Amino acid sequence: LYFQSNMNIFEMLRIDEGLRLKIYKDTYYTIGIGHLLTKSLNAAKSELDKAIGRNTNGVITKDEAEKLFNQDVDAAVRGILRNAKLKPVYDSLDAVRRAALINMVFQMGETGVAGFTNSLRMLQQKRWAEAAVNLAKSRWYNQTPNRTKRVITTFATGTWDAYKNLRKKLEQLYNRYKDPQDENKIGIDGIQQFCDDLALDPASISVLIIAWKFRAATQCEFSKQEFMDGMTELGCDSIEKLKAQIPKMEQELKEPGRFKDFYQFTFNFAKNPGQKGLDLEMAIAYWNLVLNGRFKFLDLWNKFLLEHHKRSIPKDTWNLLLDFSTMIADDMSNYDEEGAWPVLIDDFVEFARPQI
Ligand SMILES: *CC(C)C(=O)NC[C@@H](NC(=O)[C@H](Cc1nc2ccc(C(C)C)cc2s1)NC(=O)CC)C1CCCCC1
């Protein structure tokens, strides 16, 4: 198995497709770099466990994801060779250009790549410039403009320059924010610098929207992995490019489905690692940021919690408050006293009703 050509392909597709260490929901059960497990979560974990050779519980290491990737590369290579429209192109290409073709197969399947009849012809004929121009005219160039440009450059040059240069630009940028006492992460100072460079306050909602798009785990913490993967997925190689992405992130929250996802992420981001709940003071601080102009009883809710609850906020209570905020009438007349709401919200309605 180890005799086959080589593994710059793993990092190439880690940049283009991304690496997920936990079982993710695909448009179904997927892990690593696009590795399909089945078509029940118990069956997905069963397939993953048998493939890895341990009880993973849905979480794998980078090396474990690399092993699944190599199996997917080999499967793709076999498929390409069994395809009459792809094999003559594949056989004729060098190791680097073969990797760019496998990348296309990973993204749209063999049928989709086969559709580029005129472009494949130019590639087989070693007309690199003509193929680079023709592949840019395609719709594939608009779906993934960052990925497509990288793949086109790989076919045009026969080098890893597009991926090397992006990693170099991001690595130099990372050096400005990294902690002097720890290279693998961005400290308090670095986070402040990053926010300063974006001309935003670190406690602002815009920074919280960024954290949501970066899928950052904890507030006041920012790892090299989060920075590298976040910037690449957002198609940004500089602070200016990330700054220009903020209006689109804002517009996305005007859709309720995306707002629910962002609101629920805020709980996970705001909490202290090792704690299941969110401290009252921290919850109120984040509620005033995410529910500002969405919940009429927000201040009365805060006043109620500081005077009557004085305790931690669980995940379910956090999630359910968004549902309460959107259904509740201005006079609270539509509130169901025996309608599944947590005790805390029942007590809030009882406390708030005499104050109209
Ligand atoms: C001790 C400490 C850092 C602190 O003051 N924590 C509470 C306040 N939190 C913030 O100001 C955080 C700081 C940030 N953490 C990260 C982590 C990752 C990123 C990347 C770029 C995505 C960015 C930031 S900024 N800010 C936020 O959580 C955004 C609202 C603060 C006090 C009360 C108001 C909210 C929390």
Author numbering: -6 to -1, 1 to 21, 24 to 35, 38 to 164, 1062 to 1251
Authors' own words:
The cullin-RING ligases (CRLs) are the largest family of ubiquitin ligases, which regulate the turnover of ~20% of cellular proteins and play a key role in normal cellular physiology and various human diseases. Neddylation of individual cullin proteins is essential for the activation of each CRL. DCN1 functions as a scaffold protein and upholds the neddylation complex (RBX1–UBC12 ~ NEDD8–CUL3–DCN1) through interacting with both UBC12 and cullin 3 proteins. To gain precise structural insights into the DCN1-inhibitor complex formation, we determined six cocrystal structures of DCN1 in a complex with 6 (DI-1548), 7 (DI-1859), 4, 8, 9, and 10.
Installation of the same two soluble groups onto the α-carbon of the acrylamide in 3 resulted in the methacrylamide derivatives 6 (DI-1548) and 7 (DI-1859), respectively. Within 10 min incubation, 100% of DCN1 protein has formed a complex with either DI-1548 or DI-1859. Interestingly, judging by the observed molecular weight for the complex, the morpholinyl group from DI-1548 or the dimethyl amine group from DI-1859 is cleaved upon complex formation. The tandem mass spectrometry data confirmed that DI-1548 indeed forms covalent bond with Cys115 in DCN1, accompanied with a loss of the morpholinyl group. Consistent with the mass spectrometry data, the morpholinyl group in DI-1548 or the dimethylamino group in DI-1859 is absent in both cocrystal structures. Based upon the mass spectrometric data and the cocrystal structures, we propose a concerted reaction mechanism for the formal SN2′ substitution reaction between DCN1 with DI-1548 or with DI-1859 to explain the observed fast reaction kinetics for these two compounds. In this proposed mechanism, the morpholine group of DI-1548 interacts with Cys115 in DCN1 and facilitates the proton transfer from Cys115 to morpholine with concurrent formation of the C–S bond between the ionized sulfur of Cys115 and the electron deficient allylic group of DI-1548. The morpholine group in DI-1548 thus has a dual role: first, the basic nitrogen interacts with Cys115, making the sulfur atom more acidic and facilitating covalent bond formation with the electron deficient C=C bond of the enone; second, formation of a new C=C bond is accompanied by breaking of the C–N bond, resulting in a loss of the morpholinyl group as the morpholine group is at the end of the allylic system.
